[PDB]
Amino acid sequence: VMIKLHGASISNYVNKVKLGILEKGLEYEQIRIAPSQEEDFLKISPMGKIPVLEMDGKFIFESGAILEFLDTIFPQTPKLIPEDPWEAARVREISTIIETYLDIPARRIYLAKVSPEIVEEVHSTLVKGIKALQRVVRFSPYIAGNVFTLADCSGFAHLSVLDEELRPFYPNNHPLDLLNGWKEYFVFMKTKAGPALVEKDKQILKKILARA
Amino acid sequence: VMIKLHGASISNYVNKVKLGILEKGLEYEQIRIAPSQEEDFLKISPMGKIPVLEMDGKFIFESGAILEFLDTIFPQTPKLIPEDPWEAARVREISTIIETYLDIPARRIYPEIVEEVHSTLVKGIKALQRVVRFSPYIAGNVFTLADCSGFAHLSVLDEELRPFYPNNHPLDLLNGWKEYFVFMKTKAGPALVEKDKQILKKILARA
Ligand SMILES: N[C@@H](CCC(=O)N[C@@H](CS)C(=O)NCC(=O)O)C(=O)O
Ligand SMILES: N[C@@H](CCC(=O)N[C@@H](CS)C(=O)NCC(=O)O)C(=O)O
Ligand SMILES: [Cl-]
Ligand SMILES: [Cl-]
């Protein structure tokens, strides 16, 4: 098999890549591993992170570099980076906002310390990010417009997890509730085979790990 | 000219963009502003950050999206993203490591967490070592987007952390860095970027 994706289905960054692979209809195998600082893994993934893409004996790490690479070598539909450069920028903006300004903050919670205050700081930071995000998304029906893009890979993978993770922390208080279109979008994406499969694989492994 | 770069030379993310604009030989004006949460600014820059690129009455924010955009509309050498797709992945990897795994953590310093931070940086520095070539540029033999992130962020990290790790500096573990820094400073673009930063620092230099 040409493409190997290293990383388990519970990782939202793994799932971001997986969504792009599935949507293009590429053939691949997922190799379920956990992160690790063993010298052997560091050789292919310097920070000990997943996902890692393996292809042609070469390894690419970092979900963003991976998806940009796949879109370059496998330009078949959908184009994760639109050909129009302005729309490409919007796609890249959306994805950066989601990962950098929403998920990074949220990980301080759902991954440490507990403080109503700490929790409080995060609530404010997320509300700020959500409001920024609102300005660039279209959900018509995809997050950046009328076709699947990189932004849907980041959006579906991260926001689905952010949504589940933060309900415990924020009943009546969830930041996403402020993102107009999120719920419709999430339901829409779940009517699709790729996103549905990504959710299923996550659920399968979660149920299994829970029996630790 | 047809391009305006919004943000002062104090910001490493602004300097990242500036390096790429300079290296492409593009006509531009730099608008010296600070970041802001003023709604009128949030309209063109949702997170209220600098830099913001403006062209054709339209705005792009996020230094990564801006340089990928300039690469695409001004595709002439130097190509910020290599034509070879593996080399292009290397470039994006280097840039992401520098920003996410070195700069972000470093920003927790500019408490006594300075020790947990020093370990994070040695780790990030050790990972970076695995992908850089410095031959002479950060990713290889030509200027790329990774040089925009590398020169903008590393220079800052180095000076900014000397007063915290006099004999302890993690960036000293990065083989080839000092020579790269020196080499980059001989080029007209990085030299201008570095001079504007230095002027601004001498100027607002009041302890
Ligand atoms: N920026 C990285 C993030 C990857 C990441 O944080 N993955 C987690 C998912 S578990 C991980 O491998 N963590 C292990 C670690 O940080 O050591 C990417 O885009 O791939
Ligand atoms: N991810 C952004 C980072 C830009 C950034 O953090 N700029 C700083 C430089 S001062 C800023 O505008 N901070 C103001 C703020 O966060 O409100 C990028 O790559 O452009
Ligand atoms: Cl799995
Ligand atoms: Cl300035």
Same domain, B71 and B88: no
Same domain, A178 and A137: yes
CA–CA distance, B15 with B6 (Å, rounded to integer)? 11
Structurally, chain B folds into a number of domains equal to 2
- CB contact (8 A) between residue B123 and residue A69: no
- Domain with A146 in it: what CATH number? 1.20.1050.10
Q: Phi and psi dihedrals of B23, rounded to 5?
A: -65, -30
Same domain, A143 and A201: yes
Same domain, B94 and B196: yes
CA–CA distance, A6 with A65 (Å, rounded to integer)? 15
CA–CA distance, A89 with A44 (Å, rounded to integer)? 30
Same domain, B77 and B89: no
Q: Which domain holds residue A22?
A: 1-81
Q: Which of B81, B115, B133 is the last residue of a domain?
A: B81
Cα diameter, chain B: 49
Residue B86: closest CA among A95, A54, A13: A54
- Domain with A23 in it: what CATH number? 3.40.30.10
Q: Which residues of A touch B130 (CB under 8 A)?
A: 42-43, 46
Q: Yes or no: say if A143 and A155 are a contact pair by the CB < 8 Å rule.
A: yes
Same domain, B120 and B203: yes
Same domain, B64 and B96: no
Same domain, B47 and B101: no
Q: Which of A51, A81, A111 is the last residue of a domain?
A: A81
Same domain, A30 and A130: no
Q: Which of A25, A58, A81 is the last residue of a domain?
A: A81
Report how this structure was experimentally obtained.
X-ray
Same domain, A162 and A117: yes
Segment holding A51, helix H or strand E = none
Residue of A49, A55, A62 to mutate when probing chain B, most B C-beta within 10 A: A62
Q: Phi and psi dihedrals of B28, rounded to 5?
A: -155, 160
CA separation, residue A165 to residues A109, A121, A180 (Å): 9, 16, 19
Edge-to-edge strand list for the sheet holding A58-61: A28-31, A3-6, A52-55, A58-61
Same domain, B5 and B89: no
Q: Yes or no: say if B191 and B22 are a contact pair by the CB < 8 Å rule.
A: no
Residue A2: closest CA among A72, A53, A60: A53
- CB contact (8 A) between residue B68 and residue A128: no
Same domain, A59 and A86: no
CA A193 to chain B, closest CA, distance in angstroms equals: 28
